[model samples]
Target: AGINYVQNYNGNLGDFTYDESAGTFSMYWEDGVSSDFVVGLGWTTGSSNAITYSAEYSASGSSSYLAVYGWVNYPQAEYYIVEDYGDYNPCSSATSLGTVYSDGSTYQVCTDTRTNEPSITGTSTFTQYFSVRESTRTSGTVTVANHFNFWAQHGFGNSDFNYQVMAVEAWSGAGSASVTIS
Candidate 1:
């Protein structure tokens, strides 16, 4: 019911601010596969450089995916967004993975091709779909409101994206677990 956060459109979940306080939640790779990383911290912590949650590359699959082929980055950003911590319920069911703006944004340059998450590891809990476009203003929707249930402790490993931000405690009873609306 908790510990399911996602962002794929409007973007902005974790990054900077000391790499989301060592919990790491980064994004901004026009190509660099995965720039701005966070998952227990281990890319850099003092001089600043750490942020590459997971990466090895050999390619093996039943479903899991993270195929991009090419990547690179810098100040360049006409559009670059892809957030995945897994499990976010604004009311259930999420998986948009769309929008990649890039026409001009200073250091612009991109080579489109996406697919980085698709394995839910064994499965005891699995549900992902995120959408964004709300910077401010109310009523944008942020669920878990019926009885209550939002625990944490989820980190899926497909190959990379080590996952972090551990801790959601536990809860799940309300309106029969609202946001199960697949």
Candidate 2:
């Protein structure tokens, strides 16, 4: 089956637009607090089948980090590999894995954890986010599978691939962003 494109938002997504024909999305958000927005394109797959994907994005904001990330679900573990290319924010509880080079840049790899989130399978799932960071980049392309493999090679193993999602996530801040995935 093909992937489904959708927006999962909270608070105000500000003015947003998507061109399905081009696989492009753009959005603008006013300065505020406690708001979240994400444009997710995802499909179901198994761990045995490897998925290859990538995204190109440009974003800027004064108050928050604009991130392009991938979300994946497994039977016992969930994955979040965020390219935090803007200003720092504590998006989740993190255990720093120091800095390493991947996806064409140097990144501080970390293992993060999240709680109290509802999953599509109707179960509450705790997510461990293995984040790769580039603290000052505003635009780039990320090879999604590499980060996943990084985790698999480390200690995040023994989980079935449930879904593969590539998303552009934004928090409340001033400015705009445009993203395209292929």
Candidate 3:
């Protein structure tokens, strides 16, 4: 549980509760300012094995993304299996890598490079891959392995897995989120 709380930048961390025995994590975040925050569960040195989860998620703010987010270090990369979001589209400017049908939705796959951005290993440059759902959903099963397979098809896999989490991310502005991942 302690491992899933990612406090990035400088701001509030809100409240987090996890029942490890039950394999569940609960998150509530109130971001009064711009900050990158995520709370959920996963391996510290992540995995490529499929992770299927049921999440009841909700958020408010101009910029927030509820996703299965992770990092890779072999060549340095970040990836997202975005299930829901707030106002801004997380892949608005990313390069199109086609689409993937997973769970119960069609996901638009995309990639973008981040220059000198904050990452799991401090500020570093990396490419971000995304599988963003066409329509937002608040609660459902996210079979994250589908996204991984989709990325692998595009030759973007094979990197060393780092920390991964089923996360609710507040990227900008004031916002709040309540999510339970199981």
**Top candidate, metric lDDT:** 3
Deviation in Å, model 2, residue 64 alpha carbon = 4.4
TM-score of 2: 0.68
CA deviation > 4 Å runs, candidate 3: 1-11
Please provide, for model 1 over 1-182, each residue's C-alpha lDDT reduced to its tens digit, 9 standing for 90 to 100.
12233323222222221133333333322222222222222221111111122322111211112211111121111111111112222213333333222211111112222234322232222333222222211111222111011111111111223222211111111110001101
Question: 1-182, model 3: which lDDT tens digit per residue?
Answer: 23443423232455666664455765555544355666666667766665656666656564778788888886788888888887777568788899999877899899988999788678888889999898778677777677777788876665578888777776565555555455
lDDT of 3: 0.70
Task: Sort every candidate by TM-score, greatest first.
Answer: 3, 2, 1
lDDT order of candidates, top first: 3, 2, 1
What is the Cα-based TM-score of model 3? 0.82
Q: Write the per-residue lDDT of candidate 2 for residues 3-25, one digit (tens) a residue.
A: 55454554255666765555566
